[PDB]
Amino acid sequence: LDPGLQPGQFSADEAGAQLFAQSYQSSAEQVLFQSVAASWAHDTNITAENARRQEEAALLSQEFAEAWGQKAKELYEPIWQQFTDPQLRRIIGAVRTLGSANLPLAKRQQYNALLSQMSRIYSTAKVCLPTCWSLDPDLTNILASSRSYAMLLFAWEGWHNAAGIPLKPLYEDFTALSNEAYKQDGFTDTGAYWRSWYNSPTFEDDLEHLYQQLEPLYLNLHAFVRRALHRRYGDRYINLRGPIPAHLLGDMWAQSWENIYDMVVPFPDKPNLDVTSTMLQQGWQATHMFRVAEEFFTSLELSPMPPEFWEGSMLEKPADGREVVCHASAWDFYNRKDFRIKQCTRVTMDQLSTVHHEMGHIQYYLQYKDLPVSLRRGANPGFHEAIGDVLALSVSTPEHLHKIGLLDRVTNDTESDINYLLKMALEKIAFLPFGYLVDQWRWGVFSGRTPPSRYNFDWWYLRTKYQGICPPVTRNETHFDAGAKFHVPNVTPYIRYFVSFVLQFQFHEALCKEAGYEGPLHQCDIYRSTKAGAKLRKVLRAGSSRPWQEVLKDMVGLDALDAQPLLKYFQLVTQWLQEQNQQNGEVLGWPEYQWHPPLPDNYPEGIDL
Ligand SMILES: *[C@@H]1O[C@H](CO[C@@H]2O[C@@H](C)[C@@H](O)[C@@H](O)[C@@H]2O)[C@@H](O)[C@H](O)[C@H]1NC(C)=O
Ligand SMILES: *[C@@H]1O[C@H](CO[C@@H]2O[C@@H](C)[C@@H](O)[C@@H](O)[C@@H]2O)[C@@H](O)[C@H](O)[C@H]1NC(C)=O
Ligand SMILES: *[C@@H]1O[C@H](CO)[C@@H](O)[C@H](O)[C@H]1NC(C)=O
Ligand SMILES: [Cl-]
Ligand SMILES: [Mg+2]
Ligand SMILES: [Zn+2]
């Protein structure tokens, strides 16, 4: 390790630890920069050479973590836990947690290479024909817009087989090394480490209690959408008492259903709330979508995006033949200057939402960039994922869309309310079972409850139990369908999105009240409210300097996750769906749990290109 980056000498007392922490932070800045820069060069240009460079930067990061953690142990291990300063307790407790730096050199190298290779496999996989299709944009476009049973099947099967099958042996090796690493920090397994970020003894029980409250809304949305699908695909491919085939819901993972709005919309002669065709008619591009998102942030007196953001970001998929990680992300270089998005932006209404999601992450980085590096994080990971989604709730209202020239016609009547709440339910309520189940699967893999011999059997148990879907072709343990979802090979934790989907409605309700808005919660738009801005700004500036339960209390009046704001927002549509399903004679749930659809005639030969 460079002489400049090694730990010096400090006294073995709380006062010494104060000096240790400040010195620790001043070094960490330079090591973080080199890591993030190498990661950017690879994720925007996947090559064997750029992987080698990123692995070399990762190794340096591990060498730094080891040197500083050992010093914390040497000086503090028997005393830091009784330190008078809560904040200090927080940094020393982190510094003595070595993670992958606990591995011996040869295994550290093995671990870093596995990360590179899993990322490559996912982001470069394609589906070839009898020139090959990428996930983004080509397969994503098919799953969103095709109403051909056989074309949808070709895309879902091609993707799952191409991405998932080769990942399995690498994912087994990654799991074992990750657990060996975190075990030496005193965690039972890696999942116990990930859950410890919420600092709550009752986390899994509290999540289980939230889901019991939300499940009836999901079951009612599921039954009404199954019926709408039946009226299009017919009795051969839809069983009104069984699971829905996993490729027909608008999305490769069936995780949100807004792309099948046209098939589900209750009252089709009210205003058309999907504005994608208007964006295309008006000639919107990626640069327009980013500028319009920026202007929502400045309307609240939050920060614009700096020159370095515009000069360095990647806002469209490269047209030069580079392979890239298309799944969107926001980057803090840890130098208080360089902040960037990398998104393969397409011109659609759901992508405008995604732009706001990413720009939320940037705004958090701008607001806490002056805190010590160890505290440049969200209050918990759910808070970081929620910020942009909250502003997108306001943007998507019919009233806001009118203000920005995306929806000419204005109506305020009960049918128009039901259309809007149903469209928002397809986006937010359909996701809840998926946002809950992903880390239940992964926690069972890290604990050993799910060995490699049961990866796919236990994935499909969960997908059917929670989402009420079935795979549309037969699967066995050579398939690794969890591996065909970004966050699994890219080692990104998922329970943050279930947390975020609950939190965002808590935050929206609080900001709408601070704005002085007095109408129905689902019609609030906080645009141009400088008072809502100031309240959100207090959250962002806090970083991880204070317990999330306290930050939440200051913001919304309660110190806990709470489903009541979500239920209040959806109340009218919750009642309407329950009455429609009863009048229609639906069965709620999927009692014919063994059912799978038949194959199309001639499959796969009878599809044009
Ligand atoms: C598992 O499946 C492999 C791929 O075969 C395809 O998927 C299976 C589920 C069947 O539908 C089969 O008709 C398909 O062509 C098979 O190659 C394999 O031999 C099956 N068994 C094992 C152990 O992989
Ligand atoms: C839409 O209408 C909501 C309901 O308004 C109340 O009831 C209707 C029947 C009328 O009598 C009206 O004058 C009442 O105030 C309002 O709460 C809501 O603000 C309106 N929202 C928008 C965006 O126009
Ligand atoms: C992609 O990275 C390679 C290194 O493997 C480099 O030669 C090439 O110039 C890069 N391309 C771009 C467009 O940055
Ligand atoms: Cl998380
Ligand atoms: Mg979508
Ligand atoms: Zn995010």
Tab-separated table of N, CA and C in Angstrom, residues 8 18 51 56 62-63 73 91 160 229 266 342 363 376 425 439 474 504 512 525 564 571 591 603-604:
chain	number	residue	atom	x	y	z
A	8	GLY	N	-0.940	5.584	10.656
A	8	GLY	CA	0.046	6.107	11.572
A	8	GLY	C	-0.179	5.602	12.988
A	18	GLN	N	-10.751	9.252	18.301
A	18	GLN	CA	-11.273	10.395	17.549
A	18	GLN	C	-10.259	10.783	16.472
A	51	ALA	N	-11.847	-5.148	-17.159
A	51	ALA	CA	-12.061	-6.013	-15.987
A	51	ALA	C	-10.746	-6.188	-15.188
A	56	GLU	N	-7.706	-4.927	-10.207
A	56	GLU	CA	-6.497	-4.404	-9.599
A	56	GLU	C	-6.904	-3.290	-8.608
A	62	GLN	N	-9.141	-3.631	-0.905
A	62	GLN	CA	-9.033	-4.653	0.134
A	62	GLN	C	-7.782	-4.483	1.011
A	63	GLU	N	-6.648	-4.115	0.405
A	63	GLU	CA	-5.410	-3.939	1.144
A	63	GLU	C	-5.552	-2.749	2.137
A	73	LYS	N	-8.706	-2.920	15.520
A	73	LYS	CA	-8.553	-4.049	16.439
A	73	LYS	C	-7.401	-3.878	17.450
A	91	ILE	N	-18.410	4.569	13.334
A	91	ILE	CA	-17.285	4.453	12.408
A	91	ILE	C	-16.305	3.350	12.835
A	160	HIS	N	-34.123	-16.223	-20.192
A	160	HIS	CA	-33.862	-17.022	-18.955
A	160	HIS	C	-32.737	-18.044	-19.208
A	229	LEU	N	-56.763	-10.493	-18.913
A	229	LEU	CA	-55.940	-11.366	-19.777
A	229	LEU	C	-56.738	-12.508	-20.409
A	266	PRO	N	-60.217	0.419	-16.932
A	266	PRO	CA	-61.659	0.379	-16.694
A	266	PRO	C	-62.541	1.197	-17.634
A	342	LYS	N	-25.494	6.700	-15.536
A	342	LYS	CA	-25.267	5.807	-16.665
A	342	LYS	C	-26.599	5.072	-16.937
A	363	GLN	N	-29.253	13.725	-6.250
A	363	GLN	CA	-29.596	14.811	-5.339
A	363	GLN	C	-29.113	14.491	-3.915
A	376	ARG	N	-21.610	9.361	4.067
A	376	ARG	CA	-22.177	9.683	2.743
A	376	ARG	C	-22.904	8.445	2.231
A	425	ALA	N	-51.652	1.341	-9.439
A	425	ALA	CA	-51.599	0.037	-8.783
A	425	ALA	C	-50.770	-0.980	-9.598
A	439	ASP	N	-35.138	-11.310	-1.724
A	439	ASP	CA	-34.218	-11.586	-0.632
A	439	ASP	C	-34.671	-12.700	0.316
A	474	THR	N	-41.393	-25.832	-19.181
A	474	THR	CA	-40.916	-26.640	-18.056
A	474	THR	C	-39.488	-26.195	-17.659
A	504	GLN	N	-42.129	5.465	0.358
A	504	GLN	CA	-42.377	6.591	-0.563
A	504	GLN	C	-43.752	7.244	-0.314
A	512	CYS	N	-46.850	16.557	1.062
A	512	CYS	CA	-48.097	17.141	0.591
A	512	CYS	C	-48.706	17.976	1.738
A	525	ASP	N	-49.770	17.413	-6.044
A	525	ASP	CA	-48.543	17.652	-6.820
A	525	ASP	C	-47.731	18.671	-6.013
A	564	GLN	N	-50.148	2.542	6.378
A	564	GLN	CA	-51.395	3.303	6.283
A	564	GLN	C	-51.359	4.367	5.179
A	571	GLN	N	-57.229	3.825	-1.479
A	571	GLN	CA	-58.479	3.386	-0.877
A	571	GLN	C	-59.622	3.227	-1.891
A	591	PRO	N	-55.874	-21.689	-6.577
A	591	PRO	CA	-55.999	-23.043	-6.008
A	591	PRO	C	-55.528	-24.135	-6.967
A	603	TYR	N	-44.312	-24.573	-31.928
A	603	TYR	CA	-43.336	-23.724	-31.240
A	603	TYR	C	-41.949	-24.395	-31.235
A	604	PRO	N	-40.799	-23.686	-31.478
A	604	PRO	CA	-40.765	-22.283	-31.934
A	604	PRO	C	-40.763	-21.861	-33.409
